[PDB]
């Protein structure tokens, strides 16, 4: 069926206003953290130069790093941001944890920035790992270590080992060539099931088996995309029925959005108290 009465913006508002918009799902990339200062890499390469790397996606993927860490965390020093500031997006989604409206997060991105605005581990699907914990890469081990004991190796430009068993340790992130973490599918399983709406925000849906999610919602689920480029969506066909495209920047749709919905001061007022605090520590 068709739940929209208009494919805008102001349609969706509508929808979420009502009663019939009780479960959502957010899927959600590099486009929420550009404004907090984190690097994107969608469409960047001249630093890379100095590492000699086969090719520059070879930095981002599983069989490089395994044989040869160095460059992965010499570019993790010299990217590494100085402050980790959720984003007004991060902030959005913490409104509709608190108002009961998140089902759940799923995010392409490694920066925490979902936990440090409040949404909690079962909120969360991290499908492409975090930096938030790091893990010797031996099995018959696999000690842990917190971000505090990660970034202090990365700074000091000695690569984090283990010193058990004096194998190297890993952040638990998903490097390309890498398969995703149970809990992607175990959660994809029954999380679209009952889904009213999927607000899909700063991604383009390059990176499988993520970009698949869509997929899964029934058809009759409105989806938003808010992101600089439209990226299974039907926005613009004679049969589009269901999906909207807002392009622009993460902020700046959430905060209209937020308009439309009657949250932008209260969401105006969670991110002022919550980068207070930050700026405080
Ligand atoms: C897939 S889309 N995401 C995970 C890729 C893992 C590689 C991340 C590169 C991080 C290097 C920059 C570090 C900044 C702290
Ligand atoms: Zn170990």
Redesign the pocket.
Same mark, same amino acid.
């Given at each position: 069926e068709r739940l929209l009465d208009e494919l805008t913006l102001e349609g969706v508002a509508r929808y979420m206003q009502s009663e019939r918009c009780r479960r959502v799902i957010c899927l959600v990339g590099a486009g929420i953290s550009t404004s907090a200062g984190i690097?994107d890499f969608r469409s960047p390469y001249d630093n890379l130069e100095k590492y000699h790397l086969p090719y520059p996606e070879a930095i $981002?993927e599983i069989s490089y790093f395994k044989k040869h860490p160095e460059p992965?965390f010499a570019?993790?020093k010299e990217?590494?941001?100085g402050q980790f500031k959720p984003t007004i997006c991060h902030y959005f989604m913490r409104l509709l944890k608190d108002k009961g409206l998140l089902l759940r997060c799923y995010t392409?991105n490694?920066d925490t920035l979902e936990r440090i605005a409040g949404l909690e581990q079962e909120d969360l699907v991290e499908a492409?790992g975090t930096f938030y914990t790091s893990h010797c890469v031996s099995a018959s081990c696999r000690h842990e270590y917190p971000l505090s004991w990660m970034k202090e190796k990365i700074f000091s430009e000695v690569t984090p080992k283990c010193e058990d068993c004096q194998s190297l340790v890993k952040p638990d992130?998903? $490097?390309?060539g890498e398969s995703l973490p149970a809990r992607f599918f175990s959660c994809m399983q029954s999380d679209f099931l009952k889904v009213d709406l999927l607000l899909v925000m700063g991604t383009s849906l390059q990176?499988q088996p993520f970009a698949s999610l869509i997929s899964k919602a029934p058809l009759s689920t409105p989806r938003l995309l808010i992101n600089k480029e439209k990226a299974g969506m039907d926005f613009d066909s004679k049969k589009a029925y269901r999906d909207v495209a807002w392009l622009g920047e993460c902020d700046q749709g959430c905060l209209a959005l937020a308009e439309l919905l009657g949250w932008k001061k209260e969401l105006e007022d969670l991110v002022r108290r919550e980068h207070a605090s930050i700026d405080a520590q």
């Open positions: 690097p $981002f992965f570019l993790a990217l590494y941001p392409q490694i492409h992130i998903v $490097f390309f990176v």
